[PDB]
Structure formats: C-alpha cells, structure tokens
C-alpha cells in the first residue's frame, strides 16, 4: 500500500543506505584476519554474542517478511491497513550479518591462536538468552502465537545491542583515551542508525501511522541506541578525552 512513489523511492534508497553503511563495516576485520591468518586480538565473547543478536534479529525480519501467517497476526494485533515495518534491506542486513558473523567464527577456529577462548560470563549469557527464547517458544506453540514470539527475538536483539555498546563505552571510561577510535567506522554506524530511523519515519509519513514504531520496536531502539552511543563516543573522543 504505498501512496507516494517519491516517498516509496526515498524509503527504499535510505533503506539500502542503512544496509550499505552497516554491512560494509563487517569486512575490515575479516580482511585483517585473513591477511594475518590469526585472530589474537578479536574479542571472541563479542563475536559469539553478536551472532546471538544477529540471529534474533534475523528470525524476526525473515519470519515477518516471508510468513503470511505471521503477517496475518501483524494485521490482527496492530491494524488492517498497517504496512509491515520490515523492509527487504532489513532482511538483507540480517542474512548478511549472520553470514559475516559465522565467517568470523570460521576464522576464529581455523586461524585462532593466542590465549583467547573467552567463553565464561559471555557463554553464560548465550545460555540464558537461548533458554529464555526456548521457554517463550513453548509458550507461543499451543496457540501458534508466532508474532508474539518473534517480538521477543527482537527484544533480545535490543538487549544484545546494549551488550555491544555498553561494555565498549565502559572500557573507554574506566580507562581514558578512545583507544581504537575509527572515524570511518563510527561515521558509518551513525549513518546506518539515522538511515534506519529515517526509513521508519518515511514509512510513517506515507501511511500516516506511527504504529510501525511499536510494530517494530526492536528496529526503533536499535537505531536510537546506535545514534545515542555514537554521539557519546564522538563526545568521549572530540571533547571529554582528546589525547
């Protein structure tokens, strides 16, 4: 149901920009690890938890974009004339991120080395998160309440987006500099968060409904946490701790 063709185009372009500025930043690490045939420096816990995050998000986006049964539940819950708040680029990002996270896991087994296996409090996290998901799956099964369950997978992606930015900012604080500050990478993350927020807004301007912001509250909090923490990193680096 697009009303405006220019808006639908704009929604598609900023949507593909969000996929570009976010999915592109997976490659520098992969290139580095091949060149060096080693992953002594990578945070193994982070890659593991970023697979969990990217899988929860992937389940939500792929299921809502390709299941008519789940879409029917989306129209029952949020409204008859509602546009599905998942775009082709949301599905593309999720599938490409899971693929790039599994390739980095391949690089960690095949190159590995050093004294890194990390897998304590982190592994623990994976257990509790996939266990929680599993409890929720058996709750959604006796009524086939599939849209409620993929709304949990998206809440899990929100949790893990916090697990991404918090410990990082926390390191920069408990320490001092912004050590590892990548202007390029930080600019592109910011870009993906603005583009993904702008996409949702363009969808709201066209249909004239803010319900997409609750129908996909995972994507609304993903973009906002990303932008918030990027501004913080900027504000660490450009002010609070120069060097």
């Amino acid at each position: 149901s697009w009303n405006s063709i220019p808006l639908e185009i704009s929604y598609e372009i900023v949507g593909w920009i969000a996929f570009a500025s976010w999915s592109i930043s997976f490659y520098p690490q992969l290139i580095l690890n091949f060149r060096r045939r080693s992953v002594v420096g990578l945070n193994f816990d982070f890659v593991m938890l970023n697979l969990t995050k990217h899988s929860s998000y992937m389940i939500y986006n792929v299921c809502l974009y390709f299941s008519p049964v789940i879409q029917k539940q989306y129209f029952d819950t949020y409204g008859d004339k509602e546009m599905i708040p998942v775009a082709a680029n949301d599905v593309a990002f999720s599938i490409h991120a899971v693929v790039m996270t599994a390739v980095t896991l391949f690089q960690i087994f095949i190159y590995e080395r050093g004294p890194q296996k990390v897998s304590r409090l982190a592994i623990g996290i994976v257990v509790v998160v996939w266990g929680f998901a599993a409890i929720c799956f058996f709750i959604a099964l006796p009524t086939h309440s599939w849209l409620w369950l993929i709304s949990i997978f998206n809440s899990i992606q929100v949790f893990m987006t916090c697990v991404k930015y918090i410990p990082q900012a926390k390191m920069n604080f408990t320490r001092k500099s912004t050590v590892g500050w990548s202007i390029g990478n930080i600019l592109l993350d910011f870009t993906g968060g603005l583009a993904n927020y702008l996409q949702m807004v363009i969808q709201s301007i066209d249909q004239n409904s803010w319900k997409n912001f609750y129908g996909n509250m995972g994507k609304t909090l993903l973009s906002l946490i990303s932008i918030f923490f990027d501004i913080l990193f900027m504000f660490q680096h450009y002010v609070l701790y120069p060097e």
Partner: nanobody, 121 residues
C-alpha cells in the same frame, strides 16, 4: 606515552638458550596480558607466547611450546622470554607486545622496536 624496549637478542649457536627482555614504560606489566611475537625474513608476524594479566597463566605457539618460557618481573616492570633449546628456524626479530583490547572496534597493538635473535647451526 607507553614505550616497549627489547634487549637480550643476538647470535647464539643452535641448541643454546637466550633470555629476551622487554622493558615497559607507561603501564604495569602484572595488570596486563603481555605478548611476544616474531617476524622472520620474508615471513609474516607470528604470535609466539602470552602471559595472563593477574595470574601466572601462560600460552605458547606449537612451534615454541615446551622450549620457550614467558615470565614477568613485576619488581622490574619487565617481561622475559627465556627462549631455550633454540634452532636456526627461530631466527626472527622478536617484538614484545601489549594490546588495548576493544569490545567492538579494532584492538590497539603497542609494539616494541625489535631485537634480532640469529641462531647459527
């Protein structure tokens, strides 16, 4: 403001032992996971050994495992690579290393200058 100064390297005969040293400025060695790496002519940087931060735990490459022993003298802020049973193979510039490991972004490696260890058969 962090500095890593390698010394102890030079010529030794195959079978011989050397005790590489790494003087550290701007940071405590006991409060950090310290690494040793090596670069041979035409080869790529090889991870060699590492010691755990607040603990005696040590990990070694399969090429040096058993022969090389990485220790730390906190009372001199220096890391040591007691490289024993050496072979001409081990000919490489050994760098001591300390990383500023990141959560998400790239990890910052602080290298030293280097000390050639040339093993002569």
């Amino acid at each position: 403001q962090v500095q890593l100064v390698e010394s102890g390297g030079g010529l030794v005969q195959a079978g011989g032992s050397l005790r590489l040293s790494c003087a550290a400025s701007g940071f405590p060695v006991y409060r950090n996971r310290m690494h040793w790496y090596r670069q041979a002519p035409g080869k790529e940087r090889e991870w060699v050994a590492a010691i755990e931060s607040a603990g005696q735990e040590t990990h070694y490459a399969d090429s040096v495992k058993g022969r090389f022993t990485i220790s730390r003298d906190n009372a001199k802020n220096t890391v040591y690579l007691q490289m024993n049973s050496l072979k001409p193979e081990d000919t490489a510039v050994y760098y001591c290393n300390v990383k500023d490991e990141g959560w998400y972004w790239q990890t910052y490696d602080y290298w030293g200058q280097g000390t050639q260890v040339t093993v002569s058969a």
